[PDB]
């Protein structure tokens, strides 16, 4: 019992609960016992029939039991490099989309400044540009001394003027 429990929750780099390492072990044993009796690899639907459970769960457990690999094992037939040299860092900044984002921000500032200042501020705090949080209408009213219906109307004015092709063409290109 102690050995099995320890091998269950301690022998894996990605720890797996015993309750379902049990079913991985049982799936493996039944598939390799049926393989020799039938002569072929057991299709997961037949394995599910032996499971009394849905096959999709069988594929899920099959892909769960797969263990991680090492980043530093030599990958070539000849020993010259490791696996980790060929993995791209996804989290790294593209260094191209950053400049694009900055220029898009500049274009947005120019477009908003072209619009009337009240509308620009309304939309800026509506979508939370200058700050971290977009705000609801009542905040806009409390900061501009107007009712929320008036803010809805000025927002209607904003996207109405923003559909103007002068801004529409100059901004739609940025995609």
């Amino acid at each position: 019992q102690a050995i099995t429990r320890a091998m269950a929750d301690q022998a894996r780099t990605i720890r797996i609960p015993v309750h379902m390492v049990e079913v991985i072990n049982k799936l493996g044993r039944i598939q390799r016992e049926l393989l020799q009796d039938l002569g072929r690899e057991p299709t997961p639907e037949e394995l599910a029939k032996e499971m009394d459970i849905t096959p999709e769960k069988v594929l899920e457990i099959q892909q769960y039991a797969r263990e991680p690999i090492s980043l530093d094992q030599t990958i070539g037939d000849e020993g010259d490099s490791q696996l980790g040299d060929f993995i791209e860092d996804s989290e790294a900044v593209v260094a191209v989309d950053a400049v694009s984002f900055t220029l898009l921000q500049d274009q947005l500032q120019s477009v908003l400044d072209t619009l009337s200042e009240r509308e620009a501020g309304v939309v800026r705090l509506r979508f939370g540009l200058t700050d971290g949080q977009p705000r609801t209408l009542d905040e806009i009213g409390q900061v501009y001394g107007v009712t929320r219906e008036r803010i809805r109307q000025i927002e209607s004015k904003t996207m109405s003027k923003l559909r103007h092709p002068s801004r529409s063409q100059v901004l739609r290109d940025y995609l």
Partner: protein, 195 residues
């Protein structure tokens, strides 16, 4: 020979207590990445395995001490802890190296700082650089001594931001994204500004 280290421990204000170790540091996770490859397969730097071994041995020793066990088992666990820290700091220095899957020695901290493949002479002294290319050479007998030929495609790829700016300024592309699209599509106007 003894004085060579004794005098160093004397005149320098560091206690030799640091020779023995009872609290082991843990490298940042991003320096020992666990990343999912395309296909669901997972990769690790073998450091997670050694750290896991250290953690397992330490926890089991804690359990043995708290529970109360005959001194033989406690001594065996302490020896395993010592050998696990041994493997973590320098695998294969003492005894046979700690081996994982595929029957290969595991890369400890020391092996990450040794030889050609170590950090010092592979990433610090010489680095892979951007804005560079490589191609076959062909004799250029009509060139001048200070000149050299350059393939058009390689020159375009190298001077990408340069032609990007120089063409978005000449109003060929309205914005930077359009300039990138022209460059990747290799529009005819690109070559003139490239030259």
């Amino acid at each position: 020979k003894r004085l060579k280290v004794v005098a160093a421990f004397q005149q320098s204000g560091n206690s030799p207590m640091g020779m023995v170790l009872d609290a082991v540091p843990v490298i940042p996770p991003e320096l020992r990445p666990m990343v999912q490859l395309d296909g669901g397969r997972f990769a690790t730097s073998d450091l997670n395995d050694l750290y896991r071994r250290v953690i397992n041995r330490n926890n089991r020793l804690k359990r043995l001490i708290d529970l109360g066990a005959p001194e033989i088992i406690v001594n065996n666990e302490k020896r395993m802890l010592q050998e696990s820290v041994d493997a973590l700091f320098d695998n294969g220095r003492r005894g046979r190296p700690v081996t994982g899957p595929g029957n290969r020695p595991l890369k400890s901290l020391s092996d990450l700082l040794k030889g050609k493949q170590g950090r010092f002479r592979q990433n610090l002294l010489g680095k892979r650089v951007d804005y560079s290319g490589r191609s076959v050479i062909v004799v250029g007998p009509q060139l001048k001594l200070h000149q050299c030929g350059l393939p058009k495609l390689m020159a375009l790829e190298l001077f990408k931001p340069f032609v990007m700016k120089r063409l978005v300024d000449l109003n060929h592309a309205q914005n930077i994204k359009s300039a990138k699209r022209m460059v990747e599509r290799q529009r005819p106007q690109v070559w003139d500004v490239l030259e």
